[PDB]
Amino acid sequence: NSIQIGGLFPRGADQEYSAFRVGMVQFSTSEFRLTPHIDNLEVANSFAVTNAFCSQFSRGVYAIFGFYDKKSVNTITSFCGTLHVSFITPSFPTDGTHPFVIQMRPDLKGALLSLIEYYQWDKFAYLYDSDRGLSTLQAVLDSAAEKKWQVTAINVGNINNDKKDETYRSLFQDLELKKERRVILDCERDKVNDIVDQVITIGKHVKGYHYIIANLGFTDGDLLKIQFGGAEVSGFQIVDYDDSLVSKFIERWSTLEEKEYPGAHTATIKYTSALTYDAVQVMTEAFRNLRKQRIEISRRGNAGDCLANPAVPWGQGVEIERALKQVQVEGLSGNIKFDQNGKRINYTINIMELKTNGPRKIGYWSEVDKMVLTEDDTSGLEQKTVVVTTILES
Amino acid sequence: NAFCSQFSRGVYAIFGFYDKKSVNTITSFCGTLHVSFITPSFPTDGTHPFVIQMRPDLKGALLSLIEYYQWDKFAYLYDSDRGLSTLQAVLDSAAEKKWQVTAINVGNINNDKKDETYRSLFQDLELKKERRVILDCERDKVNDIVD
Amino acid sequence: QVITIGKHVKGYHYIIANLGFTDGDLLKIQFGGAEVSGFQIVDYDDSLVS
Ligand SMILES: *[C@@H]1O[C@H](CO)[C@@H](O)[C@H](O)[C@H]1NC(C)=O
C-alpha cells in the first residue's frame, strides 16, 4: 500500500521538514506507507506555487501538505477547491470557509481578545505584521468599537530592514504622544525578536510596560533578554511541554543528530514545526480510517494536466476530505479535532506570563469556556493586616 | 485558466479585472511570462511589473480631504474588497496626525439578515457620538449604507 | 550588567575612570538615556593622530 502525497516546504523550513520526517518515522505502519514528494519553492511566489501544485497533481497525489503566504493562499484554496484536492497546512487559518483545506493552526483571535479583557485594557498599541493577514487586526478593531477601546494600530511590517532604526525611534515617538505603556506584538517569531531587541535598547522594557506576544509560540522566542527588565510580558503557548506526550517527544527530539535533522537538537520546538508533526499523524489516521471503512480511492499518476478544461474533479477526493476532517487524535498541540470546513475545534491554548523564574502558565483558553485561570495565585500579599482594639466611648 | 487560455491563443496584451483574491495570480503570471496586463481595477499594493493600472491612487486625495475639514475623530467603514491599502493609510496617518479612527469592517455583513447588524453598527458609533463617517466601499455597498 | 538590570536609563550618570573612553563599546549604553562621561588621551582630531 503506497500512498503518494505532496509536500510544499518553503525554503528555510528546516525544523518544519525535520519534524515532518520524524512524523513519517513515528507514524509508519506495515498496513501502508506514505510517499512524500518534496518541493522546495518560494511560498510567496504565487506562480511557483501554482506549478508545484499542478506538478504534484500530475504525479497523481491523494493529498498535499504545505504552506502558503498572504499572497499565495488564494491560489491554494482555489485550486484545491476546484480539483477536490485536500490540502493540509500548519499556516495561518483561512479567512472564511474554504473546502478541501485542513488547518493545523487554531484561531488565536479568540484567545487574544479574552486576554485583553482579563488585564482590563482600554487603551493599547497594536503593532501588527501583514504577513499572516489582517484577520486579527480587524478582530481587535471591530471589538474596539463594542468594548470601546482606543487602539493605536501600526503596521510594523513594511519597515525596510537595511536602515530600520530611524523608523523604530519614530515609532515609539508616536507611542509616547499618548504615553502608550501597553503594546501588543502581532508578529512572527523573527519580527518579534527584532522589536524586543529595540525595546531593550530604548529601555522601554522596564517596570510600567506590558507586552503581549500575539502568537502560538510564546516560548519559541528568546525571552531571557526582556525577562529581568521589569516590564510584564504575556503570550500564548500551544505546545504544552508539561504533557507526558510532548515531554516524551522532546526526550527523543533533543537527542536527534542536528546534522541529519537541522535545528532539531533543542529542548523546545516552534509551534509551526509541532503542527507539521501533528499533521503527519492526522494524514495517517485519515488514510487508515479509509482502509478500515472499505473505501477504494486508489488511482495512478495520470490525473492529467490541472489546467484541463473542462476541469473534472475526481470523486475519490470527496472521501479523502471526509476522512481527514473526521480524524480525532492526541498530538503535541493538544486535542486535535475538526469541523466540516477544516478549522480546528475543541482545542486548548495556554495563557502564559513571564515571571522572574521564567515563563509560567496562568490558565488556558477554550473555544467554549473562554479564559479559565489555573492555580498560581501567590496568595497572599502581606494581607496580615493590623488588629486595632478600641472601646465604645463618645 | 482564462490567462493561460488567452496566452496559448498567442495574445500581445491582456485587458481585464482582478479581485483582492485573484490579483496575486495576475501580477505573478504577467511578471513571469512578461505579458502586459491593463486593468481599471484597484492599484496593486507594491511595484508589480507588466501591469498597467487605469485607476489612480485615491489614498492621497482622501488623507488631504480629512485635513481640509480638520477631522480628529471619525468613523471609517471599510470594505475588504479593494484591499486594506487605504485602511492602512488612514491608520498609519492616525498615529502621526493623531486621529481617533473607529475602523469597522462593513464587508463581512451577511446580506440575508443584514439589519440587526446595522442597528448594532450605529450603536457603537453612538458610544462616542460619531458624527463624521468615511464610507470606503463600492458603488453598491454605499447605496445600502446610505439607505 | 547595567543595561540588563536597566540602570542605564535617564537619571543615572556614569564616569569611566580611564584614559580610554572611546576604547570600549559605548553603542550599547549610548541610547539608554543615562549620561556617560570619561577621559580620552588619544585625540583623534589631531592631524598627527589622524
Ligand atoms: C472534546 O475535547 C476533550 C478534550 O480533549 C475530549 O476529552 C472530549 O472527548 C471531546 N469531546 C467530544 C464529544 O469529542
Side-chain angles (χ1 to χ4, degrees), chain A residues 1-3 5-10 12-30 32 34-41 43-55 57-58 60-69 72-104 106-108 110-122 124-145 149-162 165 167-168 170-172 174-177 180-187 190 192-247 249-250 253-258 261-269 271-286 289-290 295 297-298 301-315 317-321 323-324 327-336 338-339 341-342 344-354 356-359 362-369 371-374 380 385-394, chain B residues 1-5 7-8 10-19 22-54 56-58 60-72 74-95 99-112 115 117-118 120-122 124-127 130-137 140 142-147, chain C:
Chain A
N1 296 197
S2 181
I3 305 179
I5 62 180
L8 282 62
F9 288 76
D14 298 352
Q15 189 184 33
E16 286 79 3
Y17 185 73
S18 296
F20 181 79
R21 294 175 54 182
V22 177
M24 297 296 306
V25 177
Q26 178 60 18
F27 303 105
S28 64
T29 184
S30 303
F32 57 90
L34 282 57
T35 305
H37 191 265
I38 311 305
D39 289 334
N40 292 351
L41 284 72
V43 63
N45 191 346
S46 297
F47 171 85
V49 173
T50 309
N51 282 29
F53 175 86
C54 301
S55 178
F57 180 70
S58 295
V61 296
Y62 302 88
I64 305 179
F65 168 88
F67 303 80
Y68 51 68
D69 194 19
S72 60
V73 54
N74 289 315
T75 302
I76 295 298
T77 63
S78 188
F79 276 79
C80 294
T82 297
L83 304 182
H84 282 51
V85 178
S86 300
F87 188 87
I88 301 83
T89 180
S91 293
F92 63 90
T94 63
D95 299 352
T97 64
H98 303 92
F100 290 96
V101 177
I102 306 303
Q103 303 161 181
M104 298 289 87
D107 195 11
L108 182 60
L112 206 181
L113 297 183
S114 297
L115 190 63
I116 294 185
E117 289 191 351
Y118 169 71
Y119 294 114
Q120 299 174 353
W121 284 19
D122 54 353
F124 55 87
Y126 184 79
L127 310 185
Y128 62 93
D129 201 358
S130 55
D131 287 5
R132 301 166 313 286
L134 300 314
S135 181
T136 54
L137 174 57
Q138 296 182 2
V140 302
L141 288 185
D142 297 352
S143 296
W149 296 330
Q150 290 184 358
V151 182
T152 306
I154 300 177
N155 189 4
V156 70
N158 293 18
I159 302 188
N160 56 346
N161 281 358
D162 300 87
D165 214 30
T167 58
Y168 279 97
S170 182
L171 173 57
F172 292 89
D174 297 350
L175 300 177
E176 195 60 23
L177 295 174
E180 291 290 347
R181 292 291 179 266
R182 298 172 176 177
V183 183
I184 301 183
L185 296 186
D186 186 26
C187 312
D190 295 1
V192 166
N193 284 356
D194 294 0
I195 296 181
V196 168
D197 284 347
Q198 290 291 342
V199 166
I200 307 175
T201 300
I202 57 185
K204 289 192 180 301
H205 67 107
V206 299
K207 179 178 182 177
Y209 294 86
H210 198 294
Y211 296 99
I212 299 181
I213 312 300
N215 64 5
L216 302 173
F218 179 74
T219 59
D220 291 0
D222 184 11
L223 273 50
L224 286 172
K225 37 192 177 183
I226 42 80
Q227 182 173 340
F228 307 96
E232 294 183 358
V233 176
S234 306
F236 308 87
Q237 188 63 24
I238 192 60
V239 186
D240 193 359
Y241 296 93
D242 283 351
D243 279 348
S244 55
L245 195 165
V246 179
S247 181
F249 175 87
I250 275 59
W253 175 269
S254 63
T255 62
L256 293 177
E257 185 179 10
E258 191 175 7
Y261 299 89
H265 199 93
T266 57
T268 62
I269 177 180
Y271 74 96
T272 57
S273 299
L275 289 178
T276 299
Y277 172 89
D278 289 337
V280 177
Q281 179 177 3
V282 175
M283 304 178 65
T284 296
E285 182 71 7
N289 289 348
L290 264 30
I295 301 180
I297 62 179
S298 298
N302 283 332
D305 197 1
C306 55
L307 298 183
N309 195 325
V312 50
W314 62 310
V318 181
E319 292 292 344
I320 305 181
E321 177 189 12
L324 291 158
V327 176
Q328 185 175 350
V329 292
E330 200 73 9
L332 301 177
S333 57
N335 185 22
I336 306 180
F338 307 87
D339 56 5
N341 297 343
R344 289 191 58 180
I345 57 182
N346 197 5
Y347 56 91
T348 295
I349 307 177
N350 294 22
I351 284 71
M352 306 288 297
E353 282 188 353
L354 182 57
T356 301
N357 63 342
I362 74 175
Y364 70 91
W365 186 93
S366 181
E367 65 169 12
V368 297
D369 300 342
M371 177 165 305
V372 175
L373 277 58
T374 78
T385 304
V386 176
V387 181
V388 179
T389 183
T390 184
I391 191 182
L392 289 172
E393 194 77 28
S394 307
Chain B
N1 282 29
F3 175 86
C4 300
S5 178
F7 180 70
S8 295
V11 296
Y12 302 88
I14 305 179
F15 168 88
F17 303 80
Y18 51 68
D19 194 19
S22 60
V23 54
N24 289 316
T25 302
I26 295 298
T27 63
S28 188
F29 276 79
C30 294
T32 297
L33 304 182
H34 282 50
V35 178
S36 300
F37 188 87
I38 301 82
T39 180
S41 293
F42 63 90
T44 63
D45 299 352
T47 63
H48 303 92
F50 290 96
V51 177
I52 306 303
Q53 304 160 181
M54 298 289 87
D57 195 11
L58 182 60
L62 206 180
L63 297 183
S64 297
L65 190 63
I66 294 185
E67 289 191 352
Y68 169 71
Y69 294 114
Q70 299 174 353
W71 284 19
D72 54 353
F74 55 87
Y76 184 79
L77 310 185
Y78 62 93
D79 201 358
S80 55
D81 287 4
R82 301 166 313 286
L84 299 314
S85 181
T86 54
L87 174 57
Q88 296 182 3
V90 302
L91 288 185
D92 297 353
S93 296
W99 296 330
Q100 291 184 358
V101 182
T102 306
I104 300 177
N105 189 4
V106 70
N108 292 18
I109 302 188
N110 56 346
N111 281 358
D112 300 87
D115 214 30
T117 58
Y118 278 97
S120 182
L121 173 57
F122 292 89
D124 297 350
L125 300 177
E126 195 60 23
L127 294 174
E130 291 290 347
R131 292 291 179 266
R132 298 172 177 177
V133 183
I134 301 183
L135 296 186
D136 186 26
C137 312
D140 295 1
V142 166
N143 284 356
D144 294 0
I145 296 181
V146 168
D147 284 347
Chain C
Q1 290 291 342
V2 166
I3 307 175
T4 300
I5 57 185
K7 289 192 180 301
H8 67 107
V9 298
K10 178 178 182 177
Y12 293 86
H13 198 294
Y14 296 99
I15 299 181
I16 312 300
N18 64 5
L19 303 173
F21 179 74
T22 59
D23 292 0
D25 184 11
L26 273 50
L27 286 172
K28 38 192 176 184
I29 42 80
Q30 182 173 340
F31 307 96
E35 294 183 358
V36 176
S37 306
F39 308 87
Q40 188 63 24
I41 192 60
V42 186
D43 192 359
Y44 296 93
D45 283 351
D46 279 348
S47 55
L48 195 165
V49 179
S50 181

